[PDB]
Amino acid sequence: HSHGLFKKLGIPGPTPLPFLGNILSYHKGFCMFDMECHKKYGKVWGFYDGQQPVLAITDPDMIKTVLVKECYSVFTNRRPFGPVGFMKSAISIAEDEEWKRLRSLLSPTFTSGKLKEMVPIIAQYGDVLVRNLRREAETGKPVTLKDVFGAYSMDVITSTSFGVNIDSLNNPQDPFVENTKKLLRFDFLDPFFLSITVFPFLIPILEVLNICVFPREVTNFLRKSVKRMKESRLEDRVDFLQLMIDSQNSSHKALSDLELVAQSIIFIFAGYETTSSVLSFIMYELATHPDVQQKLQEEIDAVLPNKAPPTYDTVLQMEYLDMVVNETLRLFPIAMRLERVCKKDVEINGMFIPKGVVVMIPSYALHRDPKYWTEPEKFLPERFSKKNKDNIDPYIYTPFGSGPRNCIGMRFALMNMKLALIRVLQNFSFKPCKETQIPLKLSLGGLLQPEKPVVLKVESRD
Amino acid sequence: HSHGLFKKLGIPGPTPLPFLGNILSYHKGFCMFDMECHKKYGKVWGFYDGQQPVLAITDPDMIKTVLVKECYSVFTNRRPFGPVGFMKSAISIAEDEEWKRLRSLLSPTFTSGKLKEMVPIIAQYGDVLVRNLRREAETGKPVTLKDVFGAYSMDVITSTSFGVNIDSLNNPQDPFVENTKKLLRFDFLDPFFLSITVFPFLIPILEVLNICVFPREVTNFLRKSVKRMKESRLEDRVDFLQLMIDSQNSSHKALSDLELVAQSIIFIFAGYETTSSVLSFIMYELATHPDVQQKLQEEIDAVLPNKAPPTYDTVLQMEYLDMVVNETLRLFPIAMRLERVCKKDVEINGMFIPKGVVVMIPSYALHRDPKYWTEPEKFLPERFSKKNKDNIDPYIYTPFGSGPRNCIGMRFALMNMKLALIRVLQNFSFKPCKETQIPLKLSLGGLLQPEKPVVLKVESRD
Numbered sequence: 001h002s003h004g005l006f007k008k009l010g011i012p013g014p015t016p017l018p019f020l021g022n023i024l025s026y027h028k029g030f031c032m033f034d035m036e037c038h039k040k041y042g043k044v045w046g047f048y049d050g051q052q053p054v055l056a057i058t059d060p061d062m063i064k065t066v067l068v069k070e071c072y073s074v075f076t077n078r079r080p081f082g083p084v085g086f087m088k089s090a091i092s093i094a095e096d097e098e099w100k101r102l103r104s105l106l107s108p109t110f111t112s113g114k115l116k117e118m119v120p121i122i123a124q125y126g127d128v129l130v131r132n133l134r135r136e137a138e139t140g141k142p143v144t145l146k147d148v149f150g151a152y153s154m155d156v157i158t159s160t161s162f163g164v165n166i167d168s169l170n171n172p173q174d175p176f177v178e179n180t181k182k183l184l185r186f187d188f189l190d191p192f193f194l195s196i197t198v199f200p201f202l203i204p205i206l207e208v209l210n211i212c213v214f215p216r217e218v219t220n221f222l223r224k225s226v227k228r229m230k231e232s233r234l235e236d237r238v239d240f241l242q243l244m245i246d247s248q249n250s251s252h253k254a255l256s257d258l259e260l261v262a263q264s265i266i267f268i269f270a271g272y273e274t275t276s277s278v279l280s281f282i283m284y285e286l287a288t289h290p291d292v293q294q295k296l297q298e299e300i301d302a303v304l305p306n307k308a309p310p311t312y313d314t315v316l317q318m319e320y321l322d323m324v325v326n327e328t329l330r331l332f333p334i335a336m337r338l339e340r341v342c343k344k345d346v347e348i349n350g351m352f353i354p355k356g357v358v359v360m361i362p363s364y365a366l367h368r369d370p371k372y373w374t375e376p377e378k379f380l381p382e383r384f385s386k387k388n389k390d391n392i393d394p395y396i397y398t399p400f401g402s403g404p405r406n407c408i409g410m411r412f413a414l415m416n417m418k419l420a421l422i423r424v425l426q427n428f429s430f431k432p433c434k435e436t437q438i439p440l441k442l443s444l445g446g447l448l449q450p451e452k453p454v455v456l457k458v459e460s461r462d
Numbered sequence: 463h464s465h466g467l468f469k470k471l472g473i474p475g476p477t478p479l480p481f482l483g484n485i486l487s488y489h490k491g492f493c494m495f496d497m498e499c500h501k502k503y504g505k506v507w508g509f510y511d512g513q514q515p516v517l518a519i520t521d522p523d524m525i526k527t528v529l530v531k532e533c534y535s536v537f538t539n540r541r542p543f544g545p546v547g548f549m550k551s552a553i554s555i556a557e558d559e560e561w562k563r564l565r566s567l568l569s570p571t572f573t574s575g576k577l578k579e580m581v582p583i584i585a586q587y588g589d590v591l592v593r594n595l596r597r598e599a600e601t602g603k604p605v606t607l608k609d610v611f612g613a614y615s616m617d618v619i620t621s622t623s624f625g626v627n628i629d630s631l632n633n634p635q636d637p638f639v640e641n642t643k644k645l646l647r648f649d650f651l652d653p654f655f656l657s658i659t660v661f662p663f664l665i666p667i668l669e670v671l672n673i674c675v676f677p678r679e680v681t682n683f684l685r686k687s688v689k690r691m692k693e694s695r696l697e698d699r700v701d702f703l704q705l706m707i708d709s710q711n712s713s714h715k716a717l718s719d720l721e722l723v724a725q726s727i728i729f730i731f732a733g734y735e736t737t738s739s740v741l742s743f744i745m746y747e748l749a750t751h752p753d754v755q756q757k758l759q760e761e762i763d764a765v766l767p768n769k770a771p772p773t774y775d776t777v778l779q780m781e782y783l784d785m786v787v788n789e790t791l792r793l794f795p796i797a798m799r800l801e802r803v804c805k806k807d808v809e810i811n812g813m814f815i816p817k818g819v820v821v822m823i824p825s826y827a828l829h830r831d832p833k834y835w836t837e838p839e840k841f842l843p844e845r846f847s848k849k850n851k852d853n854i855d856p857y858i859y860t861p862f863g864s865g866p867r868n869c870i871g872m873r874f875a876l877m878n879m880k881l882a883l884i885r886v887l888q889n890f891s892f893k894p895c896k897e898t899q900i901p902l903k904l905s906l907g908g909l910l911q912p913e914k915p916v917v918l919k920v921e922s923r924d
């Protein structure tokens with residue numbers, strides 16, 4: 001059973017039911033379960049996802065050893081979560097030596113250099129986003145942000161990774177738009193993924209029936225799509241695909257054709273719903289904190305007078321904008337948790353850790369700990385002012401994780417989201433509607449997302 | 463193992479491999495496997511779908527006992543085929559007493575009476591089909607029949623079962639059109655369904671993970687869609703839904719709300735790809751047999767002079783049209799086989815049949831038997847002339863099965879397909895293109911469908 005393990009080592013936690021372990025306590029979501037545990041049990045605790053032991057840790061020293069010092073030797077991989085098919089070769093899923101080789105063949109894709117190159121592409125779709133917004137702003141109808149930010153996020157994905165150029169909002173039925181919309185963030189508390197936790201032995205079975213968590217058709221579409229573009233650019237700069245094609249010419253072992261496809265898909269999956277979700281959470285805070293929206297709009301006009309177009313350099317110039325983005329990510333860190341599988345009997349910061357345990361960092365709960373954040377629930381961007389940004393522990397605030405396996409798309413994600421904000425706020429202000437949910441409720445599911453979706457009023461600064 | 467059963471009873475057949483049984487012999491498809499067996503082995507034979515024994519029978523007496531005389535007592539159900547979820551309640555899947563109750567609450571829906579009522583609806587989409595065809599006939603581009611007949615078939619389904627009215631071809635992106643297109647005939651020789659045959663014990667497992675062969679979203683869409691229409695017509699004639707709603711007012715036990723949904727879905731699944739597939743096979747024969755198309759066009763003009771609109775009565779008037787439809791269904795009976803599970807030790811026409819065996823009628827192969835059809839591969843509509851239609855055994859030619867469990871949608875299916883043909887042939891002629899596959903090859907898969915899809919030239923009789 002292994003349900004005696006934490007009781008032995010002296011670690012506290014909720015008592016597990018047979019077979020289910022502690023999963024019935026997810027009825028209120030990971031976020032509410034994690035805070036409770038931190039409160040009830042202290043700096044460390046333990047629980048069981050079925051029979052799999054999970055050790056939670058909240059001490060910044062312990063957290064650093066795990067994600068940095070002993071990342072290569074001990075805590076290199078994440079927990080498997082379901083049948084993956086050929087997506088086993090995607091960087092975020094791959095393990096150990098395959099992972100290290102993959103992370104290397106793809107890191108130059110995410111340098112500040114290649115990213116400054118991509119700025120003018122992502123900018124062009126700032127414009128598209130505006131026109132589409134004004135069309136809803138010239139017709140005084142409340143607006144669903146995720147719909148319009150999704151269309152933008154999508155637009156940016158297609159171009160920055162394949163060269164394809166569509167305003168998805170107006171071609172909602174373009175093939176390259178349909179498949180991609182199906183690529184939604186996995187709800188790890190829906191019937192299926194729960195069942196996987198009760199029956200992880202079911203995972204092999206499903207794999208032998210080529211059942212996949214990435215719908216077989218979406219993937220089949222993109223593979224040939226990629227294997228077509230591969231053989232249309234070759235032969236006839238500047239997207240993720242080309243960067244990867246260019247890499248399997250001129251670790252090591254180059255990148256396989258199918259390995260290349262899986263990375264294409266993962267970048268899509270990672271960047272789509274996330275970008276659009278964070279952008280929604282930020283407009284929710286700007287509409288319910290009018291000062292902050294006004295202070296930010298003023299800042300944007302000074303750097304970019306005359307609605308001047310944002311550039312890479314003038315984006316990194318804006319401090320309040322960076323403050324606002326970070327404080328949103330504090331209150332809504334959409335990964336919720338960080339996790340590593342401990343692959344060896346180990347002892348770190350004076351605590352034994354037996355093989356196979358899952359080490360977990362409860363990010364959401366640390367972001368709202370009163371022991372590090374005064375008034376943690378209030379939206380106060382000044383926590384991140386260059387005055388106070390020094391009193392913030394990088395192992396307490398980790399919206400992109402930390403260490404060698406942190407978010408590879410971090411710089412890009414922030415740059416994408418900020419370009420969107422600048423062009424939007426150059427043009428509109430955003431006001432609560434009667435139908436706006438104040439104060440926002442987080443979904444009880446396994447996603448950090450709003451219970452009810454965000455709807456606001458949008459007015460032209462003209 | 464049970465792999466000794468046929469060897470014992472004195473029945474011949476191919477030797478089964480361990481675990482796989484005879485399935486490796488499906489590499490050429492059910493149709494080619496069935497003919498071979500009939501040839502090699504005679505009037506009866508046996509084989510194993512994994513460990514499940516299947517007895518084939520080709521004697522018309524034996525076939526009648528099975529589908530008619532002993533249908534209620536012995537051969538009431540079909541073989542399960544995969545995880546079905548809530549679609550377990552659909553008539554074609556349900557079993558025994560539930561089946562008999564369902565077949566009864568739905569039979570009045572398929573009377574000649576209700577069907578004559580539906581004629582003017584299905585006719586209106588004959589017109590739509592024309593306009594769309596002429597648009598491709600005024601632009602001399604070869605035409606893919608299944609695309610244009612699919613759009614028609616779809617159009618007819620939506621209206622005859624929910625009142626919805628769209629020209630799907632031009633609204634290819636209407637929600638009510640997207641879901642329905644996913645409802646495609648199951649390929650019982652793709653990786654998944656084969657695996658089910660090797661691991662039928664996997665079926666329970668999949669059911670406990672709410673995995674379904676009817677994609678959970680399509681079904682989720684229609685349920686609420688139906689539960690909306692149910693509560694918009696009620697309260698504010700003339701489709702399958704209303705007929706079923708009217709039935710759960712004024713066997714017995716009425717029809718449950720969820721039972722009603724499953725029938726809605728099955729009619730869609732049954733009528734969509736089938737109608738469009740048969741209609742394609744018929745235009746393939748009319749284009750490669752120009753006499754027959756001309757003789758039929760002449761017949762239509764005499765009954766309906768001046769492109770007069772077809773009616774129920776003038777449709778049943780047309781004999782050559784009926785001949786042509788039937789002879790197509792002979793060469794392409796798209797179910798391929800009929801099957802019943804023997805639920806008891808039984809002895810019929812002097813042959814023992816142990817419990818649990820699957821009794822199978824190899825329709826495709828009987829339709830092409832030289833022992834009943836001279837020149838079986840030739841397309842000769844005169845086999846069905848009212849002169850020779852008496853020399854045809856109803857248990858050899860069974861495109862809709864036979865007995866209490868035969869195709870409930872038969873009259874409707876024929877009437878739909880004939881209305882389509884009349885309106886089309888009143889207006890166009892259909893000629894081979896260079897890119898037409900002559901002679902058509904049947905797919906080696908588990909569907910009766912063309913290897914390559916049918917493309918023809920379409921000319922206005924104007």
Ligand code: HEM
Nearest residue numbers: 092267270271274335399400401402405406407408409413
């Ligand atoms: C607001 C946007 C995003 C947020 C908040 C976010 C957050 C995270 C977090 C917390 C992790 C886990 C880090 C760890 O385990 O320590 C992660 C991993 C990852 N992210 Fe993101 N992410 C975002 C957008 C993106 C984008 C746009 C990409 C585009 C390529 C991307 C690619 C990845 C990859 C590939 C990994 C796994 C890396 C590895 O295992 O080596 N992410 N992300």
Ligand code: HEM
Nearest residue numbers: 554729732733736797861862863864867868869870871875
């Ligand atoms: C060209 C069109 C069609 C052909 C060739 C066809 C053929 C067949 C065949 C061979 C069977 C099995 C009969 C048996 O087991 O003896 C069947 C069953 C069935 N068909 Fe069709 N079919 C067609 C269209 C339709 C349509 C339009 C509907 C619309 C409602 C429909 C509804 C059903 C149902 C419900 C069953 C199962 C009945 C029961 O189990 O009681 N079919 N069909």
Ligand SMILES: CC(C)N[C@@H](CSC[C@H](Cc1ccccc1)NC(=O)OC(C)(C)C)C(=O)NCc1cccnc1
Nearest residue numbers: 092093185186188269270271274334335336337338339
């Ligand atoms: C393979 C994929 C399905 N599983 C992850 C592996 S990476 C860790 C993720 C990151 C994440 C970030 C934001 C929102 C959701 C998830 N989940 C993580 O919280 O783990 C537990 C749920 C605690 C087990 C993946 O690759 N996701 C692609 C991606 C998405 C978003 C940002 N960056 C990358």
Ligand SMILES: CC(C)N[C@@H](CSC[C@H](Cc1ccccc1)NC(=O)OC(C)(C)C)C(=O)NCc1cccnc1
Nearest residue numbers: 554555647648650731732733736796797798799800801
């Ligand atoms: C539940 C559904 C997935 N399975 C069938 C049960 S009915 C027997 C069918 C009929 C059929 C006709 C034409 C084309 C394909 C199938 N298959 C049959 O050949 O069985 C074996 C494959 C030999 C095992 C169902 O309900 N199909 C709805 C339907 C479709 C078409 C016509 N009428 C009804």
